[PDB]
mmCIF file of C-alpha atoms in Angstrom:
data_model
loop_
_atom_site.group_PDB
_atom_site.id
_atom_site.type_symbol
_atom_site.label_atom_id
_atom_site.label_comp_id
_atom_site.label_asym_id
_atom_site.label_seq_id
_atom_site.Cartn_x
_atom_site.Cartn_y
_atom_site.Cartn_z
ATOM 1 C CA UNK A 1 10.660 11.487 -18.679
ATOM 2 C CA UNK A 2 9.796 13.477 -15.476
ATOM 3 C CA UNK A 3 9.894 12.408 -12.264
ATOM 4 C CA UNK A 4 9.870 14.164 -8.602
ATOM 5 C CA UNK A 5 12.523 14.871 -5.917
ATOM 6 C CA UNK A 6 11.055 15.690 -2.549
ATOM 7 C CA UNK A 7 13.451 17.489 -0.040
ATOM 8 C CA UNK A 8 13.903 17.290 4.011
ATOM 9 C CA UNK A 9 12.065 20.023 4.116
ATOM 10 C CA UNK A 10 8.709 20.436 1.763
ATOM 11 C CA UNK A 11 10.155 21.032 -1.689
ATOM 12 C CA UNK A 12 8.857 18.957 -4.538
ATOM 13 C CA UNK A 13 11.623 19.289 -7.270
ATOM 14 C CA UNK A 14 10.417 18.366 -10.976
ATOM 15 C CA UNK A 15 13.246 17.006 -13.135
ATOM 16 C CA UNK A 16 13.756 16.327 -17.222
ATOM 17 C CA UNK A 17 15.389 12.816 -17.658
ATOM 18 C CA UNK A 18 15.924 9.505 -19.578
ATOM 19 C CA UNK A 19 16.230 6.401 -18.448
ATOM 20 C CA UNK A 20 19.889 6.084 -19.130
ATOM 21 C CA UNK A 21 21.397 8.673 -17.122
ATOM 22 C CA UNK A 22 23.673 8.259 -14.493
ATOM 23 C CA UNK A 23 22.423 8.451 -10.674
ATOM 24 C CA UNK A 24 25.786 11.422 -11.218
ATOM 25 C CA UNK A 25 23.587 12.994 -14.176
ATOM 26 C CA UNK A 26 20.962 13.472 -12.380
ATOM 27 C CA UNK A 27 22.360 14.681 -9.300
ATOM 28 C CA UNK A 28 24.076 17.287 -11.626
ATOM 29 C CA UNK A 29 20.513 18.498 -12.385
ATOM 30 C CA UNK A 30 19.941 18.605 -9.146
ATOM 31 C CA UNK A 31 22.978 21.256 -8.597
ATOM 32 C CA UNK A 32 21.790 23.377 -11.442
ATOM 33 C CA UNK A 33 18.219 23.990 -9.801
ATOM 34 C CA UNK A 34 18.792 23.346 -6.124
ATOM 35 C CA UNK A 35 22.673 24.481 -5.401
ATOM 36 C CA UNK A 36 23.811 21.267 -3.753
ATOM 37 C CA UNK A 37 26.897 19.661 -4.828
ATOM 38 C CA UNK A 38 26.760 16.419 -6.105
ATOM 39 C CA UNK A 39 29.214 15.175 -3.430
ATOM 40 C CA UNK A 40 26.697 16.601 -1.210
ATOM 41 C CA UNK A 41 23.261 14.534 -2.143
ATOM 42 C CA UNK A 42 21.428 11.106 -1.368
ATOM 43 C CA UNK A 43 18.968 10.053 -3.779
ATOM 44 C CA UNK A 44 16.515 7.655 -1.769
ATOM 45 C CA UNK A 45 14.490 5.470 -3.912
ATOM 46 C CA UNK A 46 12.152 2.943 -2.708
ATOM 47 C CA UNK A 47 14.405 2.148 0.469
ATOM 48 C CA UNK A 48 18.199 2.579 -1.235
ATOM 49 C CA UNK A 49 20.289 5.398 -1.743
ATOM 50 C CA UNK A 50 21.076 5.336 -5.457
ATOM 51 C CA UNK A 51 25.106 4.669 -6.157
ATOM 52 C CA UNK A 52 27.138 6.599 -8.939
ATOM 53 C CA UNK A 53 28.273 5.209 -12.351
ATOM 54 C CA UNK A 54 24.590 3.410 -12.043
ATOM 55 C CA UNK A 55 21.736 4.496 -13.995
ATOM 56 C CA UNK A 56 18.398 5.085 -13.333
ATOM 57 C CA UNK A 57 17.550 2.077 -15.214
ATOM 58 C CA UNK A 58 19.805 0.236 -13.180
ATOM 59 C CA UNK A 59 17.563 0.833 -10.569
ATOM 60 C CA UNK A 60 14.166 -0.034 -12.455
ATOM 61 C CA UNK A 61 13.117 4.384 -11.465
ATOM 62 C CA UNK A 62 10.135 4.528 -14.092
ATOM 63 C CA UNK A 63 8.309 7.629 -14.958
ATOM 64 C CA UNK A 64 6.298 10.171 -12.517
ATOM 65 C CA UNK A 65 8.353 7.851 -9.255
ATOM 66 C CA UNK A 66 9.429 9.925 -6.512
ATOM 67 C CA UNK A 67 13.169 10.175 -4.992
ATOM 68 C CA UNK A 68 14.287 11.154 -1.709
ATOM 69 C CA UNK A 69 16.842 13.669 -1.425
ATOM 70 C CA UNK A 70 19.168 14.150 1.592
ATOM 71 C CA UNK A 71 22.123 16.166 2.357
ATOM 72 C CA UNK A 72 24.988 15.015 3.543
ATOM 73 C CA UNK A 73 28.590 16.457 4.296
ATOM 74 C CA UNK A 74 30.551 14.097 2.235
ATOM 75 C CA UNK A 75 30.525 11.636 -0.801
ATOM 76 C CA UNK B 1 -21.444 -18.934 0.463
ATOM 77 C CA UNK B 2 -24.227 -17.193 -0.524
ATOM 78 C CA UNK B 3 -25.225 -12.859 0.284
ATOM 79 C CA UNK B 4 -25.847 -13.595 4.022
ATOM 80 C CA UNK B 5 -23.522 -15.915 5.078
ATOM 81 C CA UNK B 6 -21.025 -13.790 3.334
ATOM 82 C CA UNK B 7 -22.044 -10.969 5.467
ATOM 83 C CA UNK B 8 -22.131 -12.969 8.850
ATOM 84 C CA UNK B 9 -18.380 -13.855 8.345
ATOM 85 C CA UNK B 10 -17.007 -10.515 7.102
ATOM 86 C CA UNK B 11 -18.724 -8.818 10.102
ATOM 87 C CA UNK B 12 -17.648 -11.681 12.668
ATOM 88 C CA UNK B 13 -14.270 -10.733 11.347
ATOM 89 C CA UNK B 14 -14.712 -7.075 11.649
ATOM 90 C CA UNK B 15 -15.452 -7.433 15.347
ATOM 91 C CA UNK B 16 -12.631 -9.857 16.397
ATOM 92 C CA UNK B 17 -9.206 -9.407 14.383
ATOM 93 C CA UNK B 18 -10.497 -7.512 11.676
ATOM 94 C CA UNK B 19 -9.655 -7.903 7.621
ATOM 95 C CA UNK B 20 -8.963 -6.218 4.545
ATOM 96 C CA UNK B 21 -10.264 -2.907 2.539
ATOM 97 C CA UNK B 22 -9.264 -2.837 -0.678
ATOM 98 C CA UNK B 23 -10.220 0.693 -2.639
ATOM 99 C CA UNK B 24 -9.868 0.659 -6.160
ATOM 100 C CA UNK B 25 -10.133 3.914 -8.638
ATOM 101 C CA UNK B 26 -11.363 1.685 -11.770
ATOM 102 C CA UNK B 27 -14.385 -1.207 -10.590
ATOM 103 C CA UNK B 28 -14.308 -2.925 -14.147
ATOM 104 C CA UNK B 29 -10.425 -3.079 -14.239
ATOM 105 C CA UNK B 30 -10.244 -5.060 -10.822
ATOM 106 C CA UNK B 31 -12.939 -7.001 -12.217
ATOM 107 C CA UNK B 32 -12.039 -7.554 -15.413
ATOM 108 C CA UNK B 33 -8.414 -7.922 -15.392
ATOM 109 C CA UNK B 34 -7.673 -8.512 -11.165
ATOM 110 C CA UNK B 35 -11.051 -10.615 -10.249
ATOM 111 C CA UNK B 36 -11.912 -12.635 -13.619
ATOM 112 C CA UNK B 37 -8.489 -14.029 -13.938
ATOM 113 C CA UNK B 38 -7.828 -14.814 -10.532
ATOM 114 C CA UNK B 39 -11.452 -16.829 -11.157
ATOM 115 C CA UNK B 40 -10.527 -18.535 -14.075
ATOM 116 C CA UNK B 41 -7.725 -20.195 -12.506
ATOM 117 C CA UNK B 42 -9.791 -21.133 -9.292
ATOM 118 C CA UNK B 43 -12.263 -22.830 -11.747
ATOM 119 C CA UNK B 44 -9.363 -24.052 -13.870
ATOM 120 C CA UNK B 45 -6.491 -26.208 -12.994
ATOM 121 C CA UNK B 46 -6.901 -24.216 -8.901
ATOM 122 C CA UNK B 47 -6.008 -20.686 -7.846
ATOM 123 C CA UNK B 48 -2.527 -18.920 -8.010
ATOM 124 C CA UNK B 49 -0.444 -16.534 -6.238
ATOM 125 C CA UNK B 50 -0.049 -14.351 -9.632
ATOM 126 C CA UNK B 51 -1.853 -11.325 -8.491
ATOM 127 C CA UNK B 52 -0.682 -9.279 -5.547
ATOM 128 C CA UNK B 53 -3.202 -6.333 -4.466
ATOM 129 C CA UNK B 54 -2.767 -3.282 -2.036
ATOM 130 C CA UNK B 55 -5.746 -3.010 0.754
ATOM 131 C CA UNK B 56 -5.891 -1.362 3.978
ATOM 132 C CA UNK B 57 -6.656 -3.083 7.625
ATOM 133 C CA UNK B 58 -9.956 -2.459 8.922
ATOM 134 C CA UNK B 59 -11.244 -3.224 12.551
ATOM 135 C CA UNK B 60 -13.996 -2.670 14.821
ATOM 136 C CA UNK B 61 -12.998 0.318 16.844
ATOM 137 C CA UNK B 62 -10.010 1.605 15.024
ATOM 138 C CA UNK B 63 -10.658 4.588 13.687
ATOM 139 C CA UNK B 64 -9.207 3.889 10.026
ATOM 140 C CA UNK B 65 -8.895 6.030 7.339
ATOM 141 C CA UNK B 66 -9.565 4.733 4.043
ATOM 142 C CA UNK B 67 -7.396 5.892 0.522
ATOM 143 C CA UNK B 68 -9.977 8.276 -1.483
ATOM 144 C CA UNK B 69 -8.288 11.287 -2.314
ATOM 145 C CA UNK B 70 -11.627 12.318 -4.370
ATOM 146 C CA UNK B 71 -14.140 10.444 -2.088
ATOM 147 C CA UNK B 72 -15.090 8.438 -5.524
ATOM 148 C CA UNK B 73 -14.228 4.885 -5.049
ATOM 149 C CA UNK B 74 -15.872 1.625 -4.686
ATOM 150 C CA UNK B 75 -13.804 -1.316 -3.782
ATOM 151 C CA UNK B 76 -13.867 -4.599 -2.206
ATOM 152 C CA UNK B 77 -14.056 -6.270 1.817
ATOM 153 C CA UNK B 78 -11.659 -8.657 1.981
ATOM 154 C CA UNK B 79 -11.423 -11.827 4.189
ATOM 155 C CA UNK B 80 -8.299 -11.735 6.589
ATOM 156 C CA UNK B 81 -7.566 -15.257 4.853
ATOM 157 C CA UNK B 82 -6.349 -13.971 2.493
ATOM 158 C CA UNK B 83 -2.099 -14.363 1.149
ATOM 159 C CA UNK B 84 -0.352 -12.029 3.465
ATOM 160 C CA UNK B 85 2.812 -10.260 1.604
ATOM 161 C CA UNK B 86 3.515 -7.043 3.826
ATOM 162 C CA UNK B 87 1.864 -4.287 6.132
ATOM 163 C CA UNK B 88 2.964 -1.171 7.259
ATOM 164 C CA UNK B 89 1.673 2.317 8.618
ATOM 165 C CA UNK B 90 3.276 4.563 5.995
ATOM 166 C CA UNK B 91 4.990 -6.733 -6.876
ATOM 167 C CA UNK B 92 5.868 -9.663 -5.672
ATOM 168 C CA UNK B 93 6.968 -11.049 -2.461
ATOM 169 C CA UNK B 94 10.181 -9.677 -1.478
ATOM 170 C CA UNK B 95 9.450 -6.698 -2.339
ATOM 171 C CA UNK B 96 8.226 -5.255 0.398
ATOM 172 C CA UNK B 97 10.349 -3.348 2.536
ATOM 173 C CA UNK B 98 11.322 -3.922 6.069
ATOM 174 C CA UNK B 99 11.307 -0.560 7.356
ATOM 175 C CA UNK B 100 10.313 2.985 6.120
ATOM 176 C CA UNK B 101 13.983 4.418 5.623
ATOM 177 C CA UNK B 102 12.691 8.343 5.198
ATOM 178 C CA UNK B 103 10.185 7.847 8.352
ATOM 179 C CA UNK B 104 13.291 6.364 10.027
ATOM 180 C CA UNK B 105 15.699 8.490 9.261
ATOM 181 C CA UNK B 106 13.417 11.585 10.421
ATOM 182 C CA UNK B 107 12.791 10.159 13.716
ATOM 183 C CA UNK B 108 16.297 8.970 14.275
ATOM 184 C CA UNK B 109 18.676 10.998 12.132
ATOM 185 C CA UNK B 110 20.840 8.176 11.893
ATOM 186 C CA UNK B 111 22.973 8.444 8.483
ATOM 187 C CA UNK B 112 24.028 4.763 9.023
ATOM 188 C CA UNK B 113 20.469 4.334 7.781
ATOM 189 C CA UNK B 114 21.502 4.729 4.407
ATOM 190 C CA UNK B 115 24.266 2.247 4.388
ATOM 191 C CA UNK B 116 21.363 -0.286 4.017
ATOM 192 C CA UNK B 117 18.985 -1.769 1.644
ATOM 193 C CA UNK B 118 15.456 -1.669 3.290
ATOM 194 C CA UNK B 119 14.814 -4.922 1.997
ATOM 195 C CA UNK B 120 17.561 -6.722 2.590
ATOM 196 C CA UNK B 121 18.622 -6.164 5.680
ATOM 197 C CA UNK B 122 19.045 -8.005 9.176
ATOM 198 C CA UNK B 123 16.790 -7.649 12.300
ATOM 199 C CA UNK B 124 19.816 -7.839 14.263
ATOM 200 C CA UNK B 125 21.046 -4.499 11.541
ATOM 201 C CA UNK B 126 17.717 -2.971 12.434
ATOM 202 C CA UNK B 127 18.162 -3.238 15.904
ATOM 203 C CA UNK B 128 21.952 -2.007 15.561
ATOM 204 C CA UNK B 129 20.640 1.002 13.296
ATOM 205 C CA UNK B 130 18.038 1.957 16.545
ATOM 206 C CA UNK B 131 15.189 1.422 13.567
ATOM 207 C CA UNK B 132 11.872 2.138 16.099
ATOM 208 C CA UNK B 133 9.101 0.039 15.833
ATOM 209 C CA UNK B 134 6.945 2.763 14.585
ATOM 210 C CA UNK B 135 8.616 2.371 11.056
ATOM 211 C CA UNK B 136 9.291 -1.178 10.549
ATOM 212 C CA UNK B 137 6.982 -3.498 8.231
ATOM 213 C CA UNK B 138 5.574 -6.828 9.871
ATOM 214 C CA UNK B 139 4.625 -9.912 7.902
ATOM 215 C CA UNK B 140 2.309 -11.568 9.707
ATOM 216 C CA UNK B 141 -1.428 -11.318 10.092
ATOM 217 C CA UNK B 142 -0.854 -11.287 14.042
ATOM 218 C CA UNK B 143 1.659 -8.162 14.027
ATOM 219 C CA UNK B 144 -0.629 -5.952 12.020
ATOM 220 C CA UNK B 145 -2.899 -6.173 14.814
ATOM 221 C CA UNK B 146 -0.607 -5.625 17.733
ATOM 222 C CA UNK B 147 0.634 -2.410 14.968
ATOM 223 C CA UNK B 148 -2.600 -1.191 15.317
ATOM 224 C CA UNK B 149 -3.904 -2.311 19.038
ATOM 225 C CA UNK B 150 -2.719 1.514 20.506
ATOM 226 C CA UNK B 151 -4.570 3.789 18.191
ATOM 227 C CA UNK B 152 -7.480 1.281 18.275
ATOM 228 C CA UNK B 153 -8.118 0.901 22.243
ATOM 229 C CA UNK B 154 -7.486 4.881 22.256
ATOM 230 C CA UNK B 155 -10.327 5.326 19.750
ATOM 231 C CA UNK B 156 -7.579 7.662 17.823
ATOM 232 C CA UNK B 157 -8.259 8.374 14.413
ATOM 233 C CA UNK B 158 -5.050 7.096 11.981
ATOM 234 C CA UNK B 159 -4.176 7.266 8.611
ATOM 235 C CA UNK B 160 -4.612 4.611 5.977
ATOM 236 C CA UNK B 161 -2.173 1.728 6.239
ATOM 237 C CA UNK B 162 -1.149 -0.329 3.364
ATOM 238 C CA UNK B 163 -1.050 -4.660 3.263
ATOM 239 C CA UNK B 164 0.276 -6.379 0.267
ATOM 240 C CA UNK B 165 -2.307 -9.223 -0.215
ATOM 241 C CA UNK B 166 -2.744 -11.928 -2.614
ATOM 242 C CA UNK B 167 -7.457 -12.527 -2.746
ATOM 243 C CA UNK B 168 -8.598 -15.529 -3.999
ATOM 244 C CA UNK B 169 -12.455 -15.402 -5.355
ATOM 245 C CA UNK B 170 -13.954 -16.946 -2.098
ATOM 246 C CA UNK B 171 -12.030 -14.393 0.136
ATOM 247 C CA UNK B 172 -13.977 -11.141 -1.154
ATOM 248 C CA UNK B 173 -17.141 -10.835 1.147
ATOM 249 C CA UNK B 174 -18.562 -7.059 0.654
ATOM 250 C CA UNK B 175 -18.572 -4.228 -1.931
ATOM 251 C CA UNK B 176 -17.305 -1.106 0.181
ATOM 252 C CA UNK B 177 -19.582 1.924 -0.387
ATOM 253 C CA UNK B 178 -18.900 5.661 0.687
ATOM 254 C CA UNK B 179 -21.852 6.854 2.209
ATOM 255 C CA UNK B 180 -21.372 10.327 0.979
ATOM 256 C CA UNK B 181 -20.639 9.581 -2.826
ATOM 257 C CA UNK B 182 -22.798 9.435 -5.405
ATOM 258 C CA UNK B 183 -20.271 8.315 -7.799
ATOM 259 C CA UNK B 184 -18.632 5.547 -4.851
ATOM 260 C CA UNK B 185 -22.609 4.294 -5.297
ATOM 261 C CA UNK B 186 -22.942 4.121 -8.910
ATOM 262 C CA UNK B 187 -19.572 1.957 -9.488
ATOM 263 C CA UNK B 188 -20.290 0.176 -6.367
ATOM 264 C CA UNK B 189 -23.445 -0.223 -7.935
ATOM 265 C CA UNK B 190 -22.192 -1.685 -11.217
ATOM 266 C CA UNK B 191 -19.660 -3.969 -9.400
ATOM 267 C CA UNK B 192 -21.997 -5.512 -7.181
ATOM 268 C CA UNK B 193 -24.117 -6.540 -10.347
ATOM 269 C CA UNK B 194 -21.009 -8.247 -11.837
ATOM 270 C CA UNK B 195 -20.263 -10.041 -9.646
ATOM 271 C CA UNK B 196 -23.329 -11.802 -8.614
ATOM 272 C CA UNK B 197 -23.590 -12.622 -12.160
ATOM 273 C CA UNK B 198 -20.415 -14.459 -11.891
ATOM 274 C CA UNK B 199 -21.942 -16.118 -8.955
ATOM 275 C CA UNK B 200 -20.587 -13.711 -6.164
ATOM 276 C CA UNK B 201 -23.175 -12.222 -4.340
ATOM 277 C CA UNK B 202 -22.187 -9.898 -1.966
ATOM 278 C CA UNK B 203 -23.340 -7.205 0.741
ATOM 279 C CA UNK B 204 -22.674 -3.526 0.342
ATOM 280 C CA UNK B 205 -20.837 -2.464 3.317
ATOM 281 C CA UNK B 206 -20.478 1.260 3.959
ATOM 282 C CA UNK B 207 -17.262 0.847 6.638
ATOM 283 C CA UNK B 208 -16.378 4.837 8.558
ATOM 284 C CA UNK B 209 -14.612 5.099 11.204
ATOM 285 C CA UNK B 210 -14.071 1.468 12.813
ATOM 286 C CA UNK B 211 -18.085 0.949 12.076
ATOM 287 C CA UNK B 212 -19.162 -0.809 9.363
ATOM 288 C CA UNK B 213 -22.494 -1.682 8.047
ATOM 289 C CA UNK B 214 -24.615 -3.626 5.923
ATOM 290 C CA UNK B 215 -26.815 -1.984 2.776
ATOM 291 C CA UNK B 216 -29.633 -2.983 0.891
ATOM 292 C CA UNK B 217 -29.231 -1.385 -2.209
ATOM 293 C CA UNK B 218 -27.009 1.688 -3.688
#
């Protein structure tokens, strides 16, 4: 599936995915096109930030929906 | 009610608390699969709750944009009767969320923001987290006028806002019309028909800009 990661500051990000990968997967993806260290993201989704060893699934994140990301320093 | 008695309340409405705009991209799928079921229940054992819908809050004076991206859509006047589920600036019931947590977080930059789940969380959190006014949701038909009071008394023009509602049949008084589509006409048009023949009959009601008016025929 694809869905969208908007940044801070304009950026829409368009990501591969299934519906089973981990909230850790994705942020890995993240890394490869954006930079950011996985310790350094928040995924927002539909008012939560999106926890690791939890899927996207897990969170109900169908296709073409829209995360949040955030940097932060830590975790 | 019948056409004009329909109209008389939507526009006494309009010009006191105001009501509902509810913009739709496919006429015959609210009608056929939103409207007709909602109907059959009414007419049936008595209405349900089963159908949530988004619509926008329109007023006399407040300069309210409507969701179009193409400038193609028909839709439907709502009364402000009907089932209240959620309103903000920026399913069913508890899903709304109590707060925008990106809008927040860019006006506050408060990272504690995220240690929350926007819809479960306290007003006495909110008001810990500094969560301003400007992004929180309200719930009740009151609140979303006092939300929009400022930009209507300045006569300042504002983005579409988005209610969670819950129509009944007997709550849908006009067929919303953009003046400057030909293709908002010819489904506003079709849905007009379709529902008068289900007994509905109903004004066309081009609404702009805090104005809205009657039509004879698109």
């Amino acid at each position: 599936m694809q869905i969208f990661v908007k940044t801070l500051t304009g950026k829409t990000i368009t990501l591969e995915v299934e519906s089973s990968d981990t909230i850790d997967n994705v942020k890995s993806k993240i890394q490869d096109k954006e930079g950011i260290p996985p310790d350094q993201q928040r995924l927002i989704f539909a008012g939560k930030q999106l926890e690791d060893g939890r899927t996207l699934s897990d969170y109900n994140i169908q296709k073409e929906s829209t995360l949040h990301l955030v940097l932060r320093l830590r975790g | 009610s019948n056409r004009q008695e329909k109209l008389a309340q939507l526009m006494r409405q309009f010009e006191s608390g105001g009501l509902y705009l509810r913009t739709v991209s496919d006429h015959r799928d609210e009608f056929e699969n939103t409207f007709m079921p909602k109907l059959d229940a009414c007419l049936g054992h008595g209405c349900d709750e089963r159908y949530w819908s988004s619509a926008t809050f329109i007023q006399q004076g407040l300069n309210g944009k409507v969701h179009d991206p193409h400038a193609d859509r028909t839709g439907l006047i709502i009364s402000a009767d009907a089932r209240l589920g959620g309103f903000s600036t920026f399913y069913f019931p508890g899903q709304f969320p109590k707060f925008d947590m990106m809008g927040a977080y860019q006006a506050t930059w408060n990272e504690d923001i995220f240690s929350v789940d926007a819809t479960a969380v306290s007003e006495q959190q909110m008001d810990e987290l500094g969560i301003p006014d400007e992004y929180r949701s309200v719930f009740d038909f009151d609140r979303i006028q006092e939300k929009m009071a400022q930009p209507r008394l300045a006569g300042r023009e504002v983005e579409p806002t988005e209610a969670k509602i819950c129509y009944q049949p007997k709550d849908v008084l006009g067929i919303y019309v953009d003046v400057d589509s030909p293709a908002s006409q010819s489904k506003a048009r079709e849905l007009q028909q379709a529902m008068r023949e289900q007994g509905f009959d109903l004004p066309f009601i081009a609404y702009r800009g805090g104005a809205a008016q009657e039509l004879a025929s698109v």
